[PDB]
Amino acid sequence: SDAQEILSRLNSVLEAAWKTILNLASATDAAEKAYKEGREEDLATYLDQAASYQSQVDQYAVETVRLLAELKKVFPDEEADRALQIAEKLLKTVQEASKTLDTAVAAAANGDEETFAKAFNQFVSLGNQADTLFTQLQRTLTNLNKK
Amino acid sequence: SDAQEILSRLNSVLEAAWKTILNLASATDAAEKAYKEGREEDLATYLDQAASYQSQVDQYAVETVRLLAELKKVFPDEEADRALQIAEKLLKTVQEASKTLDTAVAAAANGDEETFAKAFNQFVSLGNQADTLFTQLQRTLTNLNKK
Amino acid sequence: SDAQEILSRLNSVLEAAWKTILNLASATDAAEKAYKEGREEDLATYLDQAASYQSQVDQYAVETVRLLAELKKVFPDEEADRALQIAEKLLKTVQEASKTLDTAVAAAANGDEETFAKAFNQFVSLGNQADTLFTQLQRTLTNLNKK
Ligand SMILES: C[C@]1(c2nc3cccc(C(N)=O)c3[nH]2)CCCN1
Numbered sequence: 001s002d003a004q005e006i007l008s009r010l011n012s013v014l015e016a017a018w019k020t021i022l023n024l025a026s027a028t029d030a031a032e033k034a035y036k037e038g039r040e041e042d043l044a045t046y047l048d049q050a051a052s053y054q055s056q057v058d059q060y061a062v063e064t065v066r067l068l069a070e071l072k073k074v075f076p077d078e079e080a081d082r083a084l085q086i087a088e089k090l091l092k093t094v095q096e097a098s099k100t101l102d103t104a105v106a107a108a109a110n111g112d113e114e115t116f117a118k119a120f121n122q123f124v125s126l127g128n129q130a131d132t133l134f135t136q137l138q139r140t141l142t143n144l145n146k147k
Numbered sequence: 148s149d150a151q152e153i154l155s156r157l158n159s160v161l162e163a164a165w166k167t168i169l170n171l172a173s174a175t176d177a178a179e180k181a182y183k184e185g186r187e188e189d190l191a192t193y194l195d196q197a198a199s200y201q202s203q204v205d206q207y208a209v210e211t212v213r214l215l216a217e218l219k220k221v222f223p224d225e226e227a228d229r230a231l232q233i234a235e236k237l238l239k240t241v242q243e244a245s246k247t248l249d250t251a252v253a254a255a256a257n258g259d260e261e262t263f264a265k266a267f268n269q270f271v272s273l274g275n276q277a278d279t280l281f282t283q284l285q286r287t288l289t290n291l292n293k294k
Numbered sequence: 295s296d297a298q299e300i301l302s303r304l305n306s307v308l309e310a311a312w313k314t315i316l317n318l319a320s321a322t323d324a325a326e327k328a329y330k331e332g333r334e335e336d337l338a339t340y341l342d343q344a345a346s347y348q349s350q351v352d353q354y355a356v357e358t359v360r361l362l363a364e365l366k367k368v369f370p371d372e373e374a375d376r377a378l379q380i381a382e383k384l385l386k387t388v389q390e391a392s393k394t395l396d397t398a399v400a401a402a403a404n405g406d407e408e409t410f411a412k413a414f415n416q417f418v419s420l421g422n423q424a425d426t427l428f429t430q431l432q433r434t435l436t437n438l439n440k441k
Pocket residue numbers: 021024025026028054057058093094095097124126127128130131134
């Protein structure tokens with residue numbers, strides 16, 4: 001059925017997204033360390049790496065919404081509505097993380113540490129919120145895949 | 148011992164950024180056409196391309212600020228400060244365009260056309276604002292390179 | 295083919311190599327954290343990422359040796375000779391780090407903590423040796439571009 005072709009594609013997207021999230025976590029931790037140590041040039045490199053991975057998470061989150069919107073169109077009922085709603089909230093949170101990371105990158109480039117720290121700390125908190133939604137989405141999809 | 152290399156890197160970054168801006172414009176035009184013609188799958192492809200190019204413009208704009216900030220440290224004069232201020236305003240505008248494109252991409256994925264159209268038109272306007280600052284920056288750098 | 299173009303290539307290679315070394319350091323830190331926290335799948339991913347960056351460092355080291363030998367032919371200079379000797383010692387050291395990282399990868403795959411711990415500790419010690427050599431190389435290249 002198209003429904004399980006879509007669920008299959010969704011599992012592949014989310015597996016790829018998880019790998020990217022692990023890379024984003026590494027880059028985020030490295031940026032925090034460079035920031036603590038006053039290594040400004042190293043921090044710039046780690047922030048650019050984080051922004052690259054965050055852009056990739058954003059793309060995967062968009063693809064996840066598009067796939068669940070497609071799944072809902074093949075369903076005659078609201079079985080996939082909950083998963084789509086989670087995925088849409090995930091995407092909203094991921095894009096907020098992206099915007100706030102951008103504010104941090106610009107503040108670091110502008111040499112405005114107070115703005116940098118505020119935005120970077122928001123980015124970290126949004127990432128934790130996104131992680132909660134990501135795991136919720138995985139659980140919801142497992143219940144749609146049956147076997 | 149450094150400013151000439153900084154200036155040459157800046158010229159290379161801005162040349163690469165302009166090509167990316169042209170590619171972004173082509174993707175934007177193609178997305179507008181797909182939207183008007185109701186071809187949602189085509190629109191998704193063109194929006195993903197636009198988002199990729201926009202992320203690259205964002206990166207080049209960050210690099211531009213960092214290079215001009217370095218130049219201002221080496222040669223702390225009014226020319227350098229003016230160039231950096233223009234580049235910082237360019238980066239601000241580029242990142243506003245990036246966040247607005249994110250809203251549009253999410254709306255298209257969510258099937259929310261009212262939000263998509265409003266955000267997409269805001270994105271176009273911010274792009275034109277960024278173009279003005281980009282050309283202003285080029286004129287200032289001409290005065291800084293002195294041939 | 296001219297002395298100045300070869301130096302320009304060397305400067306670019308070492309710039310790129312330092313960014314790759316930063317990525318290797320972030321992946322290594324993330325692997326250490328996953329190892330300490332007992333997250334074996336995360337550890338496996340970060341070891342694979344570290345090995346990828348280590349292999350890229352190895353290739354930049356190869357290219358640096360080749361380029362310095364080319365520079366000695368067209369612009370003899372006791373300092374290019376010094377740089378080549380450092381770069382060759384660096385190449386040997388980064389290859390040894392790659393070997394020990396490979397041993398760590400295999401030990402994680404086999405679930406052999408005793409072998410893993412020894413190999414990972416050796417990898418760290420060799421990375422610090424390579425870091426010292428890389429700093430010496432950067433200093434020598436700075437002198438080659440003219441003190
Ligand atoms: C906790 C952490 C994080 N987990 C995420 C899960 C899904 C999305 C994002 C995101 N930023 O878009 C996440 N960010 C580790 C990487 C930085 N923060």
